[PDB]
C-alpha cells in the first residue's frame, strides 16, 4: 500500500503475445473507429502481411503515422509501478526484455 498503491501505482499496457509493456500503443481511432490497444510486435505490415502468400477484416489498426497494421490486437493492461516501465526504457538500450507472464494463453 505504501511503496506502491499509494505512490506510483500505474495501470500500464503489456503485450499478451510479447510480454512487454513498451511495444504497446494505442491504435488510432476514426470518426467511426476508436483507438485500440495494439502490440507493435504483434502486428503485420499492411504493405507485406503475407500479401504475396495471402484477411479477417477488422485486425488492421492505424498508427499516428497513419500506417495500417494487421494483428497487434492482443495486448492488455496490468498494474505495476511506472518506474518498472522506466526499466524497459533503459533495457531497450540494454538489449533485453521482459517476458511478462499472465493469465490464459
Amino acid at each position: 500500500d505504501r511503496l506502491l498503491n499509494s505512490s506510483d501505482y500505474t495501470q500500464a499496457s503489456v503485450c499478451r503475445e510479447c510480454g512487454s509493456i513498451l511495444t504497446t500503443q494505442q491504435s488510432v481511432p476514426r470518426i467511426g473507429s476508436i483507438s485500440t490497444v495494439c502490440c507493435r510486435r504483434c502486428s503485420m505490415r499492411f504493405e507485406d502481411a503475407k500479401k504475396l502468400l495471402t484477411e479477417d477484416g477488422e485486425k488492421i489498426f492505424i498508427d499516428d503515422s497513419q500506417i495500417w497494421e494487421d494483428g497487434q490486437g492482443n495486448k492488455f493492461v496490468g498494474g505495476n509501478e511506472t518506474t518498472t516501465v522506466a526499466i524497459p526504457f533503459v533495457l531497450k538500450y540494454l538489449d533485453s526484455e521482459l517476458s511478462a507472464m499472465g493469465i490464459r494463453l
Binding site: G32, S33, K50, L53, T54, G57, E58, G73, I103
Partner: protein, 201 residues
C-alpha cells in the same frame, strides 16, 4: 526459414465454419452455438446473484452486440458454468467459492457458456425488406435486426431508376419488398455494424 511462420499465420488465421444458405434458399447459418470459456469480474454487490451478477455485469450487455472474438453479434447465451475455485467438490454446492484478488474486494472467475452468435461470411445470400432507395444504395433490414444496404455500384446497371427516388429492377419493373443478394462486406469498425451487400454476384 520463413515459411514455418507463414504456416503460423495461415493456421492461426484460419476460419472455423462457412455457414451455408439454409436449404440454399434461406440465409447462411451464420447463427451458431459455440461453447466458450470467459473470464469475468464479480462485484461484491452480486454476491447474492452471482450467475445473475455475471449476467448483469458482462453477459447482459453483450447480447445483441458484436464480438470481435466470436466474429459477430451475440445472439444469446446458453449453459453458464462457473469454474469452481476448489477440486473435490462433486461439482455442486448450494454456495460456490471463488478466488478474490489480493488487492480488492472484487472477485474474478471463470465461466463456461455456449454462445448463439450470428457469424456471417462473405458470399452469404440474404433477403431484406427494402428500407430505403437512394441513388447510391438500397437499405434493407434482415430479420428486422441487421441493417443491410446495396450501393448503386454493387447493383447491376441493368437495374432501373424511377424518380430518394425509386429503383426499378433489371427486368423493367421497380423493386419492392425483399431482396436476395450476396454479401460483399460487413462493416463493423463503426459504432455498430453495417453489412455491405451486392446485387451483381
Amino acid at each position: 526459414n520463413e515459411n514455418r511462420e507463414t504456416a503460423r499465420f495461415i493456421k492461426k488465421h484460419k476460419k472455423q465454419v462457412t455457414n451455408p444458405i439454409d436449404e440454399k434458399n434461406g440465409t447462411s447459418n451464420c447463427i451458431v452455438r459455440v461453447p466458450i470459456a470467459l473470464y469475468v469480474s464479480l462485484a461484491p454487490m452480486y454476491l447474492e446473484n452471482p450467475l445473475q451478477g455475471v449476467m448483469k455485469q458482462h453477459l447482459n450487455p453483450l447480447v445483441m452486440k458484436y464480438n470481435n472474438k466470436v466474429g459477430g453479434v451475440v445472439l444469446g447465451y446458453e449453459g453458464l458454468k462457473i469454474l469452481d475455485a476448489d477440486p473435490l467438490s462433486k461439482e455442486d454446492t448450494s454456495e460456490k467459492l471463488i478466488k478474490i484478488t489480493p488487492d480488492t474486494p472484487f472477485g474474478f472467475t471463470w465461466c463456461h457458456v455456449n454462445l448463439y452468435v450470428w457469424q456471417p461470411q462473405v458470399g452469404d445470400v440474404l433477403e431484406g425488406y427494402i428500407f430505403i432507395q437512394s441513388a447510391s444504395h438500397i437499405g434493407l433490414l434482415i430479420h428486422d435486426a441487421f441493417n443491410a444496404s446495396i450501393k448503386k455500384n454493387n447493383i447491376p446497371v441493368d437495374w432501373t431508376f424511377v424518380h430518394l427516388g425509386h429503383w426499378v429492377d433489371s427486368n423493367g419493373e421497380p423493386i419492392d419488398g425483399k431482396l436476395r443478394f450476396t454479401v460483399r462486406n460487413v462493416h463493423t469498425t463503426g459504432r455498430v455494424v453495417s453489412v455491405d451487400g451486392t446485387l451483381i454476384s
